[PDB]
Design a protein around this ligand. Structure first.
Ligand code: 78K
Ligand code: 78K
Lengths: 317, 317
């Protein structure tokens, strides 16, 4: 229960990006009012007060709201930051607000579906022309050769050289277990895993008319790239960045690691690729039919001269 | 599902200890018959055949028995190693056996309670004077100051120095979450965490009359030690070793790491200790009332001049 909060506060990229994204908007926040949607243990509301906000409403649905109230008190801000328990959809604020801040991004950007609550608060509580922090988000994909996966699968074929027993038949079993499922896998990668230049496949402007309906219909787009070299293709990694009106908070595997890691879409088995193998496809992020908070990703892809294939993923538990 | 098997075969201590423990008994195994209780993917049965066993019955209750049959075939041993699906309690072997091998140890030695199946097979299938591999087990305890836990709890009090927001009130919350529960926690430690000389608190001779009834009544004993230095005491670590009639397979945090890690018994909160603080107590490993395969540990302990305390733990899921 503390574990998610520990991961957040140990994430220097996340924490410093928000701290400085908020501080860069001092001019817009000075003497103004802020709503923190899903304030958690409260650090973003405190940052907003430290950037000069007159008053901050920290709205938190979970039990941890009590810790935000204590953090506010410890920092001497109890008369300017008000912690309000419950869903933002039904909280009663005493006034409309000049800015909304929220740490709404989930794995694969949209898992848990919190953006809809930020948009609900924007409509209900944000003053005309008010500020959203962050203001926008971009989605990226790249083909991957997951070096750790390669090693895990291949180790069965190395048992003979280490213990004198051939265990290579386990490779196919392990491949079925680790790649043959249809779950999105959250795992951190690096440049050593990235097989082609990353491609931006969608852009979300949080204030833009129609975004709520786009989320319901599916967010995404097509991509195309060409492989850097020869390797087993394991699938694709999806990640995001968000922008504070600019400072960019990135979750790319080519940038410093974050608690969001990346969302991995594994093909049913490895596919050999070579330098300049063309890969194209389409990725759509959707709410799951049974749970709208569980991310679903529909992947279409075409590797080289192979036929276009499809794989329909749901977020791992 | 493959994950437990990957962890096993990547555990060089486990795999080499069994390989050499088996090979050291070549004289007793040459031309003889072996039962492998819970053969899994089969490597121990193959090792026994490579030590000269005439015939090996590899008994495996789970679905993975099919992989053991394929591993046996890949190594050309299908006419000497027979993979038999189902519980050893009801398998029909064609003959009594000269030796039993088994990888029966769980976390905290007895979690999952597989030893009882080895003892059932000994009674039912082992010839008089036959060999058990391993033959014996010892249980150890030491007081611990878990350096990673210390850092995790203390990081809340460092937030002010890194981001300018006091979050020290989260320390008590985090302590309640991470130490205030009554679950056994499986985690690997090292010498940096060990606060006093480890103490052996029980010895199990697998062939000895009465062991089945001891397991039901509880295995364990008293211990006493004196702390090396000043540190927050977080509780105790429990681990085991097993002996092949001698080669010792150790899961101590002072020895190379294994997939069994150690079983950690955290006190409800840290207790300061100093050089030469005397600690005494008693540890009993028991089957859980509701699930006999789930390990329960009853801990009595006395730190310095503090009163004796009790904590009743059950294995984490
Ligand atoms: C998104 O997926 C990752 N994710 C993120 C968080 C981060 N936290 C805290 C945010 C942060 N600013 C701090 O603690 O500093 C977001 C918090 O937002 C809360 N929340 C969600 N929808 C709400 C609503 N309609 N009204 C009010 N509160 C709502 C939710 O209960 C979390 O406590 C978490 N805890 N778990 C997660 O898996
Ligand atoms: C103990 O706690 C850790 N532990 C261990 C294993 C190791 N394996 C495989 C052993 C090994 N020699 C190989 O695969 O090389 C032990 C195997 O033993 C099987 N088993 C248990 N009781 C049985 C019975 N009465 N009759 C027949 N088979 C039985 C069980 O289904 C496992 O597959 C595992 N898989 N999970 C775990 O959590």
């Amino acid at each position: 229960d503390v574990s998610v909060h520990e991961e957040m506060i140990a994430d220097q990229v996340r924490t410093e990006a928000y701290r400085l994204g908020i501080l860069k908007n001092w001019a817009a926040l000075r003497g103004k009012t802020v709503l923190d949607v899903g304030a958690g243990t409260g650090i973003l509301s405190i940052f907003c007060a430290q950037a000069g906000a007159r008053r901050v409403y920290a709205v938190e649905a979970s039990a941890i709201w009590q810790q935000a109230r204590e953090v506010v008190r410890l920092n001497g801000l109890e008369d300017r930051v008000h912690v309000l328990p419950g869903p933002v959809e039904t909280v009663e604020l005493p006034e409309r607000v000049d800015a909304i801040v929220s740490e709404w991004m989930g794995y694969g950007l949209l898992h848990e579906s919190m953006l809809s609550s930020v948009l609900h608060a924007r409509t209900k509580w944000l003053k005309e022309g008010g500020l959203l922090l962050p203001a926008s988000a971009e989605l990226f994909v790249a083909p991957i050769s997951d070096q750790m996966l390669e090693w895990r699968l291949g180790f069965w074929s190395q048992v003979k050289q280490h213990y004198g027993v051939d265990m290579s038949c386990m490779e196919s079993f392990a491949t079925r277990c680790l790649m043959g499922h249809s779950e999105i896998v959250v795992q951190d990668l690096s440049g050593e895993d990235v097989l082609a230049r990353p491609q931006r496949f969608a852009q979300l402007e949080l204030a833009r008319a129609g975004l709520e309906q786009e989320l319901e219909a599916g967010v995404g787009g097509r991509f195309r790239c060409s492989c850097y070299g020869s390797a087993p293709l394991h699938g694709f990694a999806v990640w995001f960045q968000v922008t504070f009106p600019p400072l960019v908070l990135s979750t790319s595997p080519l940038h410093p690691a974050t608690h969001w890691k990346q969302a991995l879409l594994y093909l049913n088995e490895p596919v050999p690729v070579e330098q300049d193998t063309d890969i194209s496809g389409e990725i759509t992020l959707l709410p799951s039919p049974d749970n709208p908070r569980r991310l679903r990703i529909l992947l279409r892809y075409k590797v080289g001269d192979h036929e276009e294939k499809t794989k329909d993923f749901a977020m791992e538990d």
